[PDB]
């Protein structure tokens, strides 16, 4: 499995679960730019970490 396939599968599994709003998740985006998935929300942050 490639990175894109893993990302798609992970996003699909993650999407169903509820996600409480967390104020700090936005200013981090600006910084790193590793370019490992389109910048978004917690859902992508979690996917990249995994």
- Chosen residue from 3, 19, 28, 40 binding another protein by CB under 8 A: 28
Q: How many chain residues bind another protein (CB under 8 A)? A: 20
Judged by CB, which is closer to another protein: 18, or 27? 27
Q: Binding to another protein by residue 24, rule CB under 8 A?
A: yes
Asked if residues 15 and 43 have their Cβ atoms less than 8 Å apart, the reply is yes
Query: In which residue are the tokens 């169903």 written?
Result: 16
Which value, to the nearest 10 degrees, does the dihedral of the CA atoms of residues 10, 16, 20, 26 take? 40
The pair of structure tokens assigned to 19 is 């996600």
Q: Binding to another protein by residue 5, rule CB under 8 A?
A: yes
Q: Binding to another protein by residue 45, rule CB under 8 A?
A: yes
């Amino acid at each position: 499995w490639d990175t894109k396939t893993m990302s798609q599968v992970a996003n699909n599994m993650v999407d169903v679960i509820p996600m409480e709003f967390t104020d700090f998740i936005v200013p981090e985006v600006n910084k790193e730019l590793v370019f490992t998935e389109p910048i978004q929300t917690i859902r992508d942050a979690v996917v990249n970490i995994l």
